């Protein structure tokens, strides 16, 4: 009745009883999950924040699908870009407690997160990084389904890179590129993904991603020299080679130091890579030796 | 309205307006308007306030106007109810009571009301008073932001108004036609004669606009000037719009700029630049562009700003933006003619208070010293002269450039090394410690007897460091490995523990490529062996090369470079033509 | 007011 | 073009909502604010900002913020400008634009906002004209409104408007014909801690007071005409007559009025006037210090300065400073650093000065520099560009109005360095 | 309970100030300004129920405020109250103040605080809500009133 009432002042107060009254008997407060829910819509920030700790409290394996449902469509229709923020920490804390306890379906569990990538301008670009990374790495079921969402994350990263701020929207940049590089197994067209990558904008993205970039980039060349050498076909491992050989110069002259190092060492080893090939030396088990040491 | 529920004051507001009495009704409409003003909701008074849109009072006839403009898109209907009062005022004899009326009636945006809008565009074309033909356009640009599907008649009705010969209503209505139909190159090829004479009497900020118009389509119809001679009409643009250099209102002065800039041979453009440096009196804020503007095209033109150098100096006064604009155009400017007063100003500059600007002119001398190098070894002895100085930032943004420096010169300069050795200690900003330590990769062979001392401590702190440090570390355990691994190599496998389980999943790619690549092993082959001259190469030096110089294809004086991104509404530049089309059409 | 001004 | 404008004071409030296309939501000025946080201070902020799907233009001028919003493509310089001249016109109508100014007339500015900008489009700018649409707010006007019932708005349109010259109203009559000229000049100059001319120049600009009746063509002219360069000119005059004949041919409108700024070209040494004794002292980790600075003046040109003010940011390491000044008044800020020192009046008998110990913080290590020495200063009857006046002669009207010329200088960007 | 009552305009000039809990001068105008910072940023739409300051001892106390036009209204109370009831308070502490000046405005609390004040010691002593009975307290501010008046 009081939550019911207009007045926001004792709208709170009675928010903060059924938080209490959480801590103990949540087996009745879940029956007002609709109101908290529509309680989101007032304009007392506090008062939200409040609503959101009444849903934490109110999440299990039963109500986390369309708690998490009704909290896309607020984010998506609130405006703010700290209150989108303190949103955004707020689902990725419930989805999270506990291990993602409550999260059965992964997979619609990373089609919400490759939508929340979307939220443009949030400053915790790093922590939906991390929990792409943790998701996809703990679930080796869904693996592929992410490999290929990630990747059109890649084909994205276009217009992903209108925002290079730290910690923000690139952060998506460097959680798809490490999963798309480590799971390349997965990949079904696997060259766009190099070309992609091979795309003057990446000389425009921050330093740690363009590292990110060009380490599972060479993992990549590893996999596909590896997939033309066991098929034969050579001329594509010379095609591949002179792919290597004209994109590194571009890599070389960037302005962080580290991914300039990395660049250019990996331009020399494109060299004598193109000087063992050419005497037909099957250079590609070597180089992905450098890769399968690690697999988490 | 006094001190009571706000509910209470809006049904007395609804009494107020109610009554027969003036004084009262004006009273209402100001307390409406200043409830208009702080963003309260006055929208439940929309009826009340509605019924007086009829008034012989004129000040609350404008009052009024003030509130059906402000709420009119959320009471469709009852804001349908004012339009046959504009109606009758549209026919009034007095011509400033028409424009009122004009304005009022194409501001309401209510969809229903869309036929009898266009009528009234219509029927306004010819009023035969000119200030209700300006009113005129911009209600035909207002028609067209409320309605796309008008477009042919709107310009149509455009193509009426811009035969006028009344320079008061030429801008305004080339102003329409930017905002309706920016591809309609076709209209005005008759006009641009009268609109080049009557330039010089258009108001100014419809100056503003023409000039930009002349520019989009000049740089269509004509063929770069850079034997060629200039087309008459090229040179009736350029001469009539020659005089305006010297006008008060600064926007129109960039507009003659970027006329010039675009448009003007490359032997004659140089006298933009005293315009565009008087600009630099003016207020703080339009300095932020103008230098903004100045540094774009510094980094084509050397020569265009080189007798001014003095002017863009540094003075504490200025914010950090200021500063920091001011310092990338002394980058630009210089050369070998100056560089001595330009790094003496330089080392005043270095002991600023603004931590930030002291960071950003390192980097300028950085910068410029990779420009010149008949001035590095100077360069490097100031620079690491700084390195005295107790602040942290400085001394790593020193670090930075020294480093940078050593990239583009890798000399004998050992003792620069063991100093940076020597400050590690001390240091303690993360992108410096790795700079530092990389730096000792590259010349480990020439102070081997420090670099195993360095490692270990690096070893030490291993857990503690940056993930940046963490990987110079990496590449200096895999360096020194490769050296001298009878002394180095237990080190270099603890480091190598560290790593395997460090939660960065990019150090820990990087440790198992090292691993595999250095480490002897099972398919240790050919690459493996290679690895001595893998972590040895030689690297090319880096260019620092200004960010300027990213801004060639947006044009200079738009928003969108300003911006550096492709603002919303902007119009590519067209490269000059081939050939010019037929000189007749412009008869 | 006029004070000041001087004669032109 | 321009769709609202709010305006918003450095604390954080939102004041003044205007709205002209559509409503645009208040949630659009958390940018500034943020913008504004991350800054160093309120002087930092960018004059363009972007947001998701607005752009925001900011002046910052007489302590208050103007942000206006934009969607499409327009020239930066147009908004900045039409934005300066918003603030412009509210200082001509209420002396200056501050927060109390707008408040306590939130009428009269809501209805000169909606007449100068119309659906982002400049509809009325000219001084005399907006005059003449809306009165200014005089208190006998008011008393008479409420009188008569008479109206603040007019309903005519001004004949200057329609007229061939439309800076100016038609049909001005006042007994008492006058006219007066104002040659302001400022010094821009960088001295060293050597006392060595880094680099200055000389700012002039001429303002007009014009109280002529009828139609008159007031014609300017000067003695050395050759020292002028770079002359700029407002629409008001005839360019080709400046470039043929050399003379300021023109019609002044009614009001005050900027008619002309100059610059002196660098050929000719910037006269300095003023010079100083300086000397600061900054032991190491020591809790105190020595401050001594002698202002002097140096080409005064057989004139006196007065006036006189100086302003030093004093370092972190400052806690507070023993000085006593030998006239006006010493004031030091400790919360941000700050050396005032009110000078006023230089005595060719005593060269006012400052000098005293400085309270610095024990263990914090001596600044790497000293802060700059600004100061201000003003000599009236002398003008150091050495431009004069030739002539002022007048043809349309039979009067002889009274005729006057002044000359004052005005310390330009004056900074010292030490 | 109530520690202290603080009314101010939009720019932090005090309107009236009533202290309850031991303070010294200084101490009082910090608390002033503190409670200004605190409360004049908020919004409108902001609850009414904010946290004490520090100045006053500790946060768990409670700022009770509300504002119109450029007036704050705040009471400052400690930890145990009632929030809702200092506000029910404070409305009809208000409603009283009307009662008594006959439409009371700012005008009065430059001129007549010194009655706002004897109306304000009639509601609140020491912390010590004397009065809830509105009739009863202008029926008493009236009889103060009849007594200046007869002698």
């Given at each position: 009745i009081l939550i019911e009432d207009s007045d926001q002042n004792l709208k709170y107060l009675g928010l903060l009883a059924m938080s209490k009254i959480l801590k103990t008997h949540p087996k009745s407060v879940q029956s007002h999950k609709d109101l908290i829910l529509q309680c989101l819509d007032d304009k007392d920030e506090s008062i939200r924040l409040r609503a959101l700790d009444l849903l934490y409290g109110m999440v299990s394996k039963k109500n986390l699908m369309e708690i998490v449902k009704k909290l896309m469509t607020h984010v998506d229709k609130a405006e703010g870009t700290t209150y989108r923020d303190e949103l955004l920490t707020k689902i990725i804390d419930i989805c999270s407690?506990?291990?993602?306890?409550?999260?059965?379906?992964?997979?619609?569990?990373?089609?919400?997160?490759?939508?929340?990538?979307?939220?443009?301008?949030?400053?915790?670009?790093?922590?939906?990084?991390?929990?792409?990374?943790?998701?996809?790495?703990?679930?080796?079921?869904?693996?592929?389904?992410?490999?290929?969402?990630?990747?059109?994350?890649?084909?994205?990263?276009?217009?992903?890179?209108?925002?290079?701020?730290?910690?923000?929207?690139?952060?998506?940049?460097?959680?798809?590129?490490?999963?798309?590089?480590?799971?390349?197994?997965?990949?079904?067209?696997?060259?766009?993904?190099?070309?992609?990558?091979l795309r003057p904008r990446v000389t425009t993205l921050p330093g740690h991603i363009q590292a990110v970039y060009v380490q599972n980039v060479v993992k990549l060349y590893a996999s596909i020299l590896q997939q033309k050498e066991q098929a034969g076909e050579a001329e594509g491992a010379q095609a591949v080679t002179q792919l290597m050989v004209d994109r590194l110069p571009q890599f070389v002259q960037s302005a962080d130091l580290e991914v300039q190092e990395r660049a250019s060492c990996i331009l020399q080893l494109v060299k004598h890579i193109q000087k063992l090939q050419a005497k037909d030396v099957p250079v590609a088990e070597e180089v992905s030796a450098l890769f399968a040491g690690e697999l988490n | 309205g006094l001190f009571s529920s706000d509910l209470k004051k809006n049904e007395d507001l609804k009494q107020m307006l109610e009554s027969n009495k003036d004084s009262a009704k004006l009273d209402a409409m100001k307390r409406i308007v200043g409830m208009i003003a702080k963003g309260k909701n006055a929208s439940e008074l929309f009826p009340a306030?509605?019924?007086?849109?009829?008034?012989?009072?004129?000040?609350?006839?404008?009052?009024?106007?003030?509130?059906?403009?402000?709420?009119?898109?959320?009471?469709?209907?009852?804001?349908?109810?004012?339009?046959?009062?504009?109606?009758?005022?549209?026919?009034?004899?007095?011509?400033?009571?028409?424009?009122?009326?004009?304005?009022?009636?194409?501001?309401?945006?209510?969809?229903?009301?869309?036929?009898?809008?266009?009528?009234?565009?219509?029927?306004?074309?010819?009023?035969?008073?000119?200030?209700?033909?300006?009113?005129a356009a911009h209600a035909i640009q207002k028609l067209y932001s409320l309605d796309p599907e008008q477009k042919e008649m709107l310009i149509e009705v455009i193509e009426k108004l811009l035969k006028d010969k009344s320079t008061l209503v030429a801008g305004s209505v080339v102003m329409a036609f930017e905002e309706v139909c920016p591809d309609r190159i076709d209209l005005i090829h008759?006009?641009?004669?009268?609109?080049?004479?009557?330039?010089?009497?258009?108001?100014?900020?419809?100056?503003?606009?023409?000039?930009?118009?002349?520019?989009?389509?000049?740089?269509?119809?004509?063929?770069?000037?850079?034997?060629?001679?200039?087309?008459?009409?090229?040179?009736?643009?350029?001469?009539?719009?020659?005089?305006?250099?010297?006008?008060?209102?600064?926007?129109?002065?960039?507009?003659?700029?970027?006329?010039?800039?675009?448009?003007?041979?490359?032997?004659?453009?140089?006298?933009?630049?005293?315009?565009?440096?008087?600009?630099?009196?003016?207020?703080?804020?339009?300095?932020?562009?103008?230098?903004?503007?100045?540094?774009?095209?510094?980094?084509?033109?050397?020569?265009?700003?080189?007798?001014?150098?003095?002017?863009?100096?540094?003075?504490?006064?200025?914010?950090?933006?200021?500063?920091?604009?001011?310092?990338?155009?002394?980058?630009n400017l210089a050369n070998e003619a100056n560089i001595?007063?330009?790094?003496?100003?330089?080392?005043?500059?270095?002991?600023?208070?603004?931590?930030?600007?002291?960071?950003?002119?390192?980097?300028?001398?950085?910068?410029?010293?990779?420009?010149?190098?008949?001035?590095?070894?100077?360069?490097?002895?100031?620079?690491?002269?700084?390195?005295?100085?107790?602040?942290?930032?400085?001394?790593?943004?020193?670090?930075?450039?020294?480093?940078?420096?050593?990239?583009?010169?890798?000399?004998?300069?050992?003792?620069?090394?063991?100093?940076?050795?020597?400050?590690?200690?001390?240091?303690?900003?993360?992108?410096?410690?790795?700079?530092?330590?990389?730096?000792?990769?590259?010349?480990?062979?020439?102070?081997?007897?420090?670099?195993?001392?360095?490692?270990?401590?690096?070893?030490?702190?291993?857990?503690?460091?940056?993930?940046?440090?963490?990987?110079?570390?990496?590449?200096?355990?895999?360096?020194?490995?490769?050296?001298?691994?009878?002394?180095?190599?237990?080190?270099?496998?603890?480091?190598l523990n560290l790593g395997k389980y460090d939660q960065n999943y990019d150090i820990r790619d990087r440790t198992r490529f090292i691993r595999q690549l250095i480490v002897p092993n099972v398919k240790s082959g050919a690459l493996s062996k290679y690895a001595k001259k893998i972590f040895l190469a030689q690297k090319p030096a880096p260019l620092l090369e200004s960010p300027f110089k990213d801004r060639d294809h947006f044009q200079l004086g738009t928003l969108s470079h300003t911006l550096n991104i492709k603002a919303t509404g902007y119009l590519e530049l067209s490269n000059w033509p081939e050939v010019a089309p037929d000189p007749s059409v412009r008869n | 007011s006029h004070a000041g001004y001087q004669t032109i | 073009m321009i769709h609202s404008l709010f305006l918003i004071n450095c604390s954080g409030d939102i004041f003044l909502e205007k709205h002209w296309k559509s409503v645009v939501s208040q949630s659009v000025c958390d940018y500034f604010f943020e913008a504004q946080e991350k800054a160093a201070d309120v002087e930092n902020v960018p004059p363009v900002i972007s947001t998701p799907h607005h752009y925001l233009i900011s002046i910052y001028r007489d302590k208050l913020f103007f942000v206006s919003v934009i969607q499409t493509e327009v020239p930066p310089l147009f908004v900045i400008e039409f934005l300066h001249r918003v603030a412009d016109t509210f200082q001509d109508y209420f002396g200056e634009c501050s927060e109390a100014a707008i408040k306590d007339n939130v009428v009269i500015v809501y209805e000169l906002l909606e007449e100068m900008l119309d659906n982002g489009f400049p509809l009325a700018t000219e001084s005399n004209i907006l005059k003449e649409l809306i009165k200014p707010p005089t208190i006998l006007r008011s008393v008479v409104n409420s009188i008569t019932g008479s109206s603040n708005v007019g309903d005519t349109l001004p004949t200057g408007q329609l007229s061939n010259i439309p800076w100016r109203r038609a049909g001005v009559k006042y007994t008492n014909n006058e006219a007066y000229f104002d040659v302001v000049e400022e010094i821009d100059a960088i001295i060293d801690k050597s006392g060595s001319t880094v680099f200055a120049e000389i700012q002039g600009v001429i303002d007009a007071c014009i109280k002529l009746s009828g139609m008159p063509d007031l014609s300017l002219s000067f003695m050395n005409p050759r020292l002028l360069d770079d002359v700029s000119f407002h629409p008001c005059i005839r360019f080709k007559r400046w470039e043929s004949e050399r003379v300021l041919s023109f019609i002044p409108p009614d009001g005050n009025f900027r008619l002309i700024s100059y610059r002196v070209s660098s050929q000719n040494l910037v006269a300095i006037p003023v010079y100083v004794k300086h000397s600061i002292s900054f032991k190491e980790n020591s809790s105190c210090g020595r401050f001594d600075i002698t202002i002097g003046p140096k080409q005064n040109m057989g004139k006196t300065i007065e006036g006189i003010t100086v302003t030093v940011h004093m370092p972190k390491v400052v806690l507070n400073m023993n000085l006593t000044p030998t006239q006006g008044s010493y004031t030091f800020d400790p919360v941000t650093k700050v050396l005032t020192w009110d000078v006023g009046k230089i005595t060719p008998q005593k060269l006012p000065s400052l000098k005293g110990l400085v309270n610095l913080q024990s263990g914090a290590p001596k600044p790497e520099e000293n802060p700059s020495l600004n100061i201000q200063f003003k000599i009236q009857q002398l003008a150091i560009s050495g431009l004069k006046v030739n002539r002022l002669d007048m043809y349309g009207e039979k009067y002889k109005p009274f005729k006057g010329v002044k000359y004052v200088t005005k310390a330009g960007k004056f900074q010292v360095r030490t | 309970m109530i520690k202290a009552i603080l009314i101010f305009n939009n720019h932090g000039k005090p309107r009236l100030s009533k202290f309850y809990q031991p303070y010294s001068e200084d101490t009082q105008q910090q608390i002033i300004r503190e409670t200004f910072h605190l409360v004049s940023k908020r919004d409108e739409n902001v609850c009414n129920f904010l946290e004490g300051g520090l100045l006053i001892g500790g946060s768990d106390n409670k700022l009770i405020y509300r504002h119109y036009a450029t007036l704050y209204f705040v009471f400052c109370v400690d930890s145990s109250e009632s929030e809702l009831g200092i506000l029910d308070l404070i409305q009809v502490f208000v409603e009283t103040l009307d009662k008594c000046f006959e439409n009371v405005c700012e005008l009065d609390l430059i001129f007549h605080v010194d009655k706002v004040h004897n109306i304000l010691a009639e509601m609140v002593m020491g912390g010590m809500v004397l009065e809830t009975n509105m009739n009863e307290i202008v029926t008493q501010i009236d009889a103060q009133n009849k007594l200046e008046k007869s002698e």
């Open positions: 407690q506990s291990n993602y306890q409550y999260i059965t379906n992964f997979e619609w569990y990373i089609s919400i997160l490759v939508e929340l990538t979307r939220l443009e301008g949030t400053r915790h670009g790093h922590l939906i990084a991390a929990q792409m990374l943790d998701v996809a790495i703990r679930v080796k079921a869904i693996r592929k389904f992410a490999v290929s969402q990630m990747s059109a994350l890649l084909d994205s990263a276009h217009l992903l890179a209108s925002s290079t701020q730290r910690n923000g929207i690139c952060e998506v940049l460097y959680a798809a590129a490490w999963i798309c590089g480590e799971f390349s197994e997965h990949l079904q067209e696997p060259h766009h993904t190099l070309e992609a990558m | 306030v509605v019924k007086n849109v009829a008034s012989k009072n004129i000040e609350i006839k404008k009052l009024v106007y003030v509130y059906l403009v402000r709420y009119a898109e959320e009471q469709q209907d009852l804001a349908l109810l004012s339009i046959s009062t504009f109606q009758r005022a549209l026919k009034d004899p007095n011509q400033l009571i028409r424009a009122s009326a004009l304005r009022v009636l194409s501001s309401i945006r209510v969809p229903i009301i869309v036929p009898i809008m266009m009528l009234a565009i219509k029927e306004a074309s010819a009023d035969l008073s000119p200030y209700v033909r300006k009113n008759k006009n641009y004669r009268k609109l080049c004479n009557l330039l010089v009497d258009v108001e100014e900020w419809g100056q503003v606009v023409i000039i930009h118009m002349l520019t989009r389509y000049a740089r269509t119809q004509f063929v770069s000037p850079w034997p060629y001679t200039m087309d008459p009409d090229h040179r009736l643009l350029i001469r009539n719009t020659k005089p305006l250099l010297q006008s008060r209102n600064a926007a129109v002065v960039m507009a003659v700029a970027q006329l010039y800039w675009h448009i003007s041979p490359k032997s004659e453009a140089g006298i933009i630049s005293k315009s565009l440096v008087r600009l630099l009196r003016s207020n703080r804020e339009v300095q932020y562009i103008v230098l903004q503007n100045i540094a774009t095209m510094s980094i084509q033109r050397k020569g265009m700003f080189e007798p001014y150098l003095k002017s863009f100096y540094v003075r504490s006064t200025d914010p950090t933006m200021i500063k920091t604009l001011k310092l990338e155009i002394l980058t001595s007063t330009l790094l003496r100003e330089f080392q005043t500059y270095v002991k600023s208070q603004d931590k930030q600007f002291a960071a950003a002119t390192i980097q300028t001398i950085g910068r410029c010293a990779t420009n010149i190098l008949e001035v590095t070894d100077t360069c490097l002895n100031g620079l690491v002269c700084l390195l005295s100085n107790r602040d942290e930032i400085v001394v790593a943004e020193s670090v930075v450039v020294i480093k940078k420096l050593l990239q583009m010169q890798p000399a004998q300069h050992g003792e620069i090394i063991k100093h940076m050795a020597k400050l590690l200690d001390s240091i303690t900003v993360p992108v410096a410690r790795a700079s530092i330590l990389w730096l000792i990769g590259e010349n480990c062979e020439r102070v081997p007897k420090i670099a195993p001392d360095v490692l270990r401590k690096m070893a030490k702190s291993f857990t503690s460091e940056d993930d940046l440090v963490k990987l110079q570390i990496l590449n200096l355990g895999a360096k020194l490995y490769l050296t001298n691994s009878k002394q180095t190599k237990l080190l270099t496998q603890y480091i | - | - | -």
